[PDB]
Amino acid sequence: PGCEVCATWNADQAPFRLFGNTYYVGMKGLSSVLVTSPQGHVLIDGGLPESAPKIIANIGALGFRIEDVKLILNSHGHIDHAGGLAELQRRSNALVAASPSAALDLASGEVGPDDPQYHALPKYPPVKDMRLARDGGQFNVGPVYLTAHATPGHTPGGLSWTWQSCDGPRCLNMVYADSINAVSRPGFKFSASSEYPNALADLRHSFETLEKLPCDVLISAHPEASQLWQRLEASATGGSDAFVDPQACRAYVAAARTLLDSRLDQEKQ
């Protein structure tokens, strides 16, 4: 009874350092990112419910502990990013930060009628304790300071995150970009939803937001959308330079715009 899509998304990925105190601890098709400090760590996204043990194992393999995670951040409320959150919270006793809209999904373990994939995803374990992250909201664990950027469209509650990571004197701007791809259950119309009427305005404004972010190192919620595995392969002999590309967020938005244009053409004809 295996789901080939979930199986592919959740496939093992050996964890690795991206830049400075920023590490990848996710899976082949779903990102999770660890940002460390001696005062504890920040963890971004939780994958599917069955991703949580893999993320935890990956944190350990790097030489860190889930017990030292003091803040967990969410991108959006779909099961493939929020499903593992309840377990990660239990194992770390960390608070989870999410947008007001995503937090509604997390609290019930299922999305509402305004989600493009409402009625088309399984329920997942509800997240017990949360903090709301609004646009421009700043969060910290010791010296690592994260800023939330509202980037809805793929869901009404989409959030992207920025912070800086340093490898001594050189600092780079890190970006965890939420999904901004216009995909849905069949029959949903981004151009004509009565439950999510702001979908197009959201996507356009998110495109604007993401494309002008300071952006040295990009990790997308679905890693292949930022070519992470090509970049990782390059890093074997290339080093951290392989992950650095100041044009990455602009290219990410350009690709999403292209997808949206095609999608709107399909909805109209």
Interface positions with Zn ion (CB under 5 A): 3, 5-6, 78, 80, 119, 179
d(CA 204, CA 153): 8
Residue 222 CB, shortest distance to Zn ion, in Å, is 6
Closer residue to Zn ion (CB): 115 or 216 = 115
For the CB of residue 51, give the shortest distance to Zn ion in the complex, in Å.
11
| H/E stretch holding 101 | helix 100-108
Dihedral class, residue 239 (left if φ above 0, else alpha if ψ from -120 to 50, else beta): left
Nearer to Zn ion, 6 or 85 (CB): 6
Cβ–Cβ under 8 Å, residues 106 and 98: yes
In terms of CB distance, is 55 or 144 closer to Zn ion? Answer: 55
Provide, rounded to whole angstroms, the least separation between the CB of residue 236 and Zn ion: 27
Q: Which is nearer to Zn ion, 173 or 227 (by Cβ)?
A: 227
Collapsing DSSP to helix, strand or coil, 253 comes out as helix
Which tokens sit at 69? 């995670």
**Smallest gap, in angstroms, from Cβ of residue 200 to Zn ion?**
17
DSSP assignment of 12-65 equals ----EEEETTEEE---SSS--EEE--TT-EEEE---SGGGHHHHHHHHHHTT--
Judged by beta carbon, residue 15 or residue 26, the one nearer Zn ion is 26
Q: How far is the CB of 75 from Zn ion (least distance, A)?
A: 8
Tokens of 27: 């899976």
